[PDB]
Amino acid sequence: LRLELAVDKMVTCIAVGLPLLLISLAFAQEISIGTQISCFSPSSFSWRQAAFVDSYCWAAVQQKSSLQSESGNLPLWLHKFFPYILLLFAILLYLPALFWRFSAAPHLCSDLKFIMEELDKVVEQYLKTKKNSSHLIMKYISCRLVTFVVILLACIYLSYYFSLSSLSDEFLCSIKSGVLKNDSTIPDRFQCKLIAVGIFQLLSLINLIVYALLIPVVVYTFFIPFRQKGYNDLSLYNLFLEENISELKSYKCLKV
Amino acid sequence: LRLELAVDKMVTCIAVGLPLLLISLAFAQEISIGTQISCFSPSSFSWRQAAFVDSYCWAAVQQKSSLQSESGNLPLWLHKFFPYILLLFAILLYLPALFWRFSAAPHLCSDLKFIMEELDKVVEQYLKTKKNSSHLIMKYISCRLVTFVVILLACIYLSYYFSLSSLSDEFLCSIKSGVLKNDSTIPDRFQCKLIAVGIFQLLSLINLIVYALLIPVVVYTFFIPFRQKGYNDLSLYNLFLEENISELKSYKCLKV
Amino acid sequence: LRLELAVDKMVTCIAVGLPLLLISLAFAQEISIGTQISCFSPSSFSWRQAAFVDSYCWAAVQQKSSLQSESGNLPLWLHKFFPYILLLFAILLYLPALFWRFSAAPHLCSDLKFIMEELDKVVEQYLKTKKNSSHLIMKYISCRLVTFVVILLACIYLSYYFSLSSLSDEFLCSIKSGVLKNDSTIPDRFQCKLIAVGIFQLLSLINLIVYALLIPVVVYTFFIPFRQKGYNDLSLYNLFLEENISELKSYKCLKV
Amino acid sequence: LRLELAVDKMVTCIAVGLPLLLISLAFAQEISIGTQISCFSPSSFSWRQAAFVDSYCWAAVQQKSSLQSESGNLPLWLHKFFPYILLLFAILLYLPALFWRFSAAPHLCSDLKFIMEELDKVVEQYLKTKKNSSHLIMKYISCRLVTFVVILLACIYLSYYFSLSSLSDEFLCSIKSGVLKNDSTIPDRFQCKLIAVGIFQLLSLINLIVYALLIPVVVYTFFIPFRQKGYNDLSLYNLFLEENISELKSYKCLKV
Amino acid sequence: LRLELAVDKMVTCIAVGLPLLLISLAFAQEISIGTQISCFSPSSFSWRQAAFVDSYCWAAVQQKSSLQSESGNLPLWLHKFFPYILLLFAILLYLPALFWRFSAAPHLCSDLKFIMEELDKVVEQYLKTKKNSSHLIMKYISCRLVTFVVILLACIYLSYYFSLSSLSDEFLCSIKSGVLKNDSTIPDRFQCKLIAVGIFQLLSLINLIVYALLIPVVVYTFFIPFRQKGYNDLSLYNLFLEENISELKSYKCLKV
Amino acid sequence: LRLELAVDKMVTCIAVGLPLLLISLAFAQEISIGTQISCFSPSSFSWRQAAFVDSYCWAAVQQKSSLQSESGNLPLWLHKFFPYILLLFAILLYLPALFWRFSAAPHLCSDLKFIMEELDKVVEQYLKTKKNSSHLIMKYISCRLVTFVVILLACIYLSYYFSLSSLSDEFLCSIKSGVLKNDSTIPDRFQCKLIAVGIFQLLSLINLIVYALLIPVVVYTFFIPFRQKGYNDLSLYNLFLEENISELKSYKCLKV
Amino acid sequence: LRLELAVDKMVTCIAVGLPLLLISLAFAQEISIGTQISCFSPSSFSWRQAAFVDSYCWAAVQQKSSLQSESGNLPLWLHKFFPYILLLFAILLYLPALFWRFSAAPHLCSDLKFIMEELDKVVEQYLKTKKNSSHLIMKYISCRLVTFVVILLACIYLSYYFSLSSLSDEFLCSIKSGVLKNDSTIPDRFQCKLIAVGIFQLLSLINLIVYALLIPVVVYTFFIPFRQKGYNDLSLYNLFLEENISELKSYKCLKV
């Protein structure tokens, strides 16, 4: 028996898998390249001093006092945490489906089975009572609206992230804080690079295109009365029946 | 049968999975970056001497004698054991559900089956006797209260951890202890960084927001008498039936 | 029952498996060699300075300001993202089959079961009504056309990628931007190599040959009336029956 | 049909999983940090010589002749083998459950099934004969006592281990034994650190707290006659029935 | 039911698994050594410069401009792509069996079930009609011929590959291309070695011997009229029956 | 049915798992420490020369000519192959149980089922004929004796291994063989360490204690007539019936 | 049913698993030590130059021109390919059992089921006809003979491999070929070691002992007439019946 429509499950699967697939590709590239940041330290620096510079600048991306970037410090904030936000979007998009299957799936399952059993025998009072009620349709529309809002916010974020200048992956960092402040052997600023930024912007473009094409599909899902071929549980039950009526032989015989 | 309510199941699933998911991402970042601490040692130091400095300062965070930090030794202590506390919270939140499914699921399942079978035939004395009793409701409320207290403590900890100044990941360490005390070639103090601190604070913020949103949900779960749409087993049985009444065709027939 | 034709399933499996197999082999080479780019930096450069040059040139293949390549910066752009586009093609070729299985396969399954159960007894009006409809055939042809267009675009891309000159993996890069601009110790240009390009072009040739062989197969699939042995659901139902009639003993009895 | 009480299963699961979970966390931290010991060696030493010093001091932890430590040789010995003892405790606590599930489990299962099948036909002589016997109760109490003794020994060990001074992770070692004795280029003593000591002590504290909480639970399990709501098989069969009586509909009818 | 003969399945399994097994051994050896090429570079070269030389010469095996080899650049091309050709052979040998299973196996299964059931009378026209047809024998012979041709081409390739002189793994390479052309500090030619070549030639000898032994087996499969103990579809049915007739009790009784 | 006794299953499980568990711990430590042998070579040696010294000394533990050890070359030989002997014991202890399961389990199962089916109806002649026979008892005693002998040999070995002096992990090696013999820049002897020896001795002590405790259990299993509550199949059948009689309700009814 | 005798399946499992287990141990040791070959190169050699020497010598074992070994160049060839030959033996020993299960198991199963069903009712003519035939006994003896010959060849190879002198792991190599021939800075010969030779010889000894013990077992299997308790299918069927007769209660009833 089906408790989720084909278009809804397609949308959920795309919106959840795509961010995770892109995260997997980004992680593979990260392990392949070996570093998400690289700083140019002097040749007098030993290997561990250069590694300290790299790690300090990586940790200093989130600190105001030791950075200088032409695009501002917000772009450098986002480059470091890009995969985290993608997984956050994936979880937030997967949750509404989880809540629907936990809460409303069983009640709709029972109602559909009861309707299909009263059908195949001919229940009008049951259908009219559902027409009066607006319980399940409210849950369905609320879940779809949460999904739509999450997708819209993801589109806004990915459009902003892709908007960041390609040279936003460069920044100047200073390690001369604390005891190192008066170290005359350390240069004042180090030129750093965020290596993965180039991958992240193309991944954001891909996800943005997919979500922009997916938004109209989600919008079409709200017009539940129009999909049926007012806003009441009767309308949603009708849609589920038509998507499910293929399993009722009597329906096919009547169609003939 | 549904021996656990949808709200309880979703709350437990979120409260347990989220810390584990954040720990997984933190571990992925830890392996990607490669170091949880980087110390700036002289250029004259060999690579093994610099590695010794790093490992000594990593283990010296818990030692008050050989450190100097403006935020105190306590915040530096927390930075080192952040993921472990997350796993501790995950275990402490998963345990109450485990105890419920071990010590209360069978007895509730048997009672529900008996009530459902005595129904579908029409038991009043059984329901009144349950109204007198207060056994299962006490277990349910105790488990919910344990979960609520654990979540409140997690919120307090994560609000404290996120409150630590971003510059609390820096500290001065000394290795000149023991035979190294008279070594004039070793600097008195080394500048250290806790690299993962920046990401740990964002993870703490995410978990804090999620748990702060979950607290009102858990609080609403306590009012078992008001969730029906006194504090006795009759109320819990009524809630479980209404959540599970969908599995009886006679109920739907009567509703029609 | 079979809701997907043998040739269609073969084509989908080949088209969605070959790019993934090539991606797996490319990943194997990437891990084996350990570097996707190698730059020749002075001997005075420390190890970490040379690593910075390598990673900076890796991140600067997507930036015009820091490149000088005889074949243009577009071919160098493609060399970096070749494995991603293979997975893009794999997903775009797997999606139509999944959408067919989700939104068209069960209805055809029910229709075939009804037809076979009505047969084995002799329904003519049902078949004529299907002849008077173009619902499922439109979905089938749309999915086949989407697959054909995706395969044609993949062929065009792979033919272009394979056309890139073998020496297109070489390019000159400069790290002297920003603070490093006035550094007289850094050479103006570094000679870089894209090592995986040699593997990628042979993989592209293999995929191009396979997809060019598949194009005629996909084209033959469009002529649904010819495979039957007009453009309406009757032809598709007839084809599916003849492919699946083997599971009807009465058909064999009539054959003999 | 539950052949193990809920309290016993909970106790066994906690006592076995917790040491394994702590071992997993310790192993992850050991991999992430990369060194269980770091020794400070002269800068004249090549890297292989410093690695030899580290390995020799790691192997010399168990050799009194070549080490000097103010806390004694025993605490340094324990730091090296902490996870091994944790797994030893885990195995020793899992074994009694294994022995109970192999022997005395099928016998109790058969006896319970016979008693329940004789019930629903209302056996008194059978219950009285079991009252005379003291066979299965002896095995149950022996297993519980073994578990209690193992938990008490684990508590004693963990309380001792946590009691070790934090500075017990430092010790002086000499590699000048054998052909290296007269090597004037090697310093007499090297300062060593055990990096995982600080984490191991927190893990020991966690396990100690959990096991100290479990001890009263285990002690409560011995009073089998008082858990009813003399020491004979009847007193154990009664408890197992009350735990498993939920699967007897006639019992619920009689209760009503 | 056996839809594919024992000899056919044996041949397919050997011809597919053996190349994959050899690929697994080759990959294990490659990871064991870590380098598929090693070039001797001056001691003045830094380690990163020598790594660049190694990678450049690895990528320069496919380029005529920067290579000198007495055996020609063709043998050097093959050494780099030996496992790829093995996997190509494995896929090309697995495909015909896949197509047989997808497009011919079910029809033969249905025919066998029909004829088997009729033979259990306790049908002559069906057998004669099959004798007057070649629909399935043509498919079987086409698949066998494709497999035979693929195996013959694999034998030719492996015999050629093994024929390459053992010294063919050596070649001279020049990195002085582009800005490096006028670098007087770089030697004109670097001697290179393909380390895996020694493994690859023995793996090729093993595979060549196995496929040379399999060729007569495959050739024997074409004489379908002779295996039964003319070229028409009846003969294939006879062979499949004799293979599968062991499941008919009536056949054994008649044999007695 | 239980074709193997609880005591025998426990003994086999312990004897097989314990060596494998200790091997797993040893392997984990080996990978964590990163080296099984450390040798002190001059500082003039480059890193690769010191690595050659380490590997040559590792390979020369089995060669008498190039080593001088205080405890003899035999103890140094054992240190290198300790885990392999543990796995050898594991295999040799798992084999007898496998041979029993493959050569006595089916006949025993059939005999037990026949006896149980003839019982539950009341066969005396069958039991007397079994009394007049020693077929299965010989197999059982032979398997138990093989297990006992293997355990005794393992105890002897582990007691010998644990008896090796702690300083047996040190030895002197010379690489000056062949062309290196006349090299005056190489020290005549190098000081080596077998690092894992200290852990291997504790693992041997653990296994020795476990097997010493297990020997009396195995010896008790030989007295098959005494466990029954002469050396012929009757006693063995009686033992397996008494262990298995719990699955016979008629037995319990008669016992009452 | 049991289509494979216990002794035969024991022999196959041992002969196939033991080489695989030894190969697994060898691979674990190879990864732990990290090198299969180590050459002593001058201290003036860079790291990459010494690595080139090691790789060239590894690839030069299969080349007569550039080596000098007093034990012959054949033994050095074998040391490099020991695990490959072990896997070859494993495959060649697993193949006969697989072919038997492919081309003998179904017919034998059908014949055994027919014989058992005709029995349990009393077929004499069937057994007498089998008395003359030799179809299946020939297959059985051929498979056993192939297994015996493979085991004998494995014993010969392992006895030869173990006979190689322990010092056969040392050899001199020259890298001065081609361009390097006139390099006066490279020594004429490098002393090399094959580190895994010492372990490989013990593994060969273990496998040799096991296979030498297995040869008499395999020889005993040929005498099919004597295993009964002439050379025709009647004897083989009788043996399989006596091994399989335990699954026929009528046989036990007659035995009583």
Numbering used by the authors:
A (entry chain F), B (entry chain G), C (entry chain E), D (entry chain A), E (entry chain D), F (entry chain B), ...: 28 to 149, 195 to 301, 323 to 349
Task: Pull text from the paper.
In this work, we present a case study using a streamlined version of the DirectMX protocol working directly from crude cell pellets to purify the ATP release channel pannexin1 (PANX1), and investigate its structural and ligand-binding properties. PANX1 is a potential therapeutic target and associated with various pathologies, including inflammation, pain, ischemia, and epilepsy. Several PANX1 structures have previously been solved and all of them approximately show similar overall structures albeit with differences in the intracellular domains15–22 and lipid-like densities at the membrane interface.
The cryo-EM structure of mouse PANX1 was solved (3.1 Å), representing the first published structure of a membrane protein extracted by Salipro nanoparticles directly from cells. Cryo-EM micrographs revealed that frozen-hydrated complexes were monodisperse with 2D class averages displaying secondary and tertiary structures, as well as heptameric organization of mPANX1. Extracellular and transmembrane regions of the Salipro-mPANX1 are well-resolved in the structure with clear side-chain density visible. In contrast, much of the intracellular regions were not well resolved in the cryo-EM map prohibiting complete atomic modelling. The dimensions of the Salipro-mPANX1 heptamer are 90 by 104 Å, which is slightly smaller than those of hPANX1, which are 96 by 109 Å. On the protomer level, the mouse and human PANX1 structures are highly similar, with a root-mean-square deviation (RMSD) of 1.556 across 256 aligned atom pairs. On the other hand, the N-terminus of Salipro-mPANX1 could not be resolved, similar to what has been reported for several other PANX1 structures. Furthermore, the structured intracellular region of Salipro-mPANX1 exhibits some minor but clear differences compared to the hPANX1 with several alpha-helices shifted; for example, helices encompassing residues 342–349 (Salipro-mPANX1) and 342–355 (hPANX1) reach a maximum displacement of ~ 5 Å. In addition, it was not possible to resolve any lipid-like density in the Salipro-mPANX1 structure. Since our structure contains endogenous lipids from mPANX1-expressing cells, this lack of lipid-like density could suggest that endogenous lipids have a certain flexibility surrounding mPANX1.
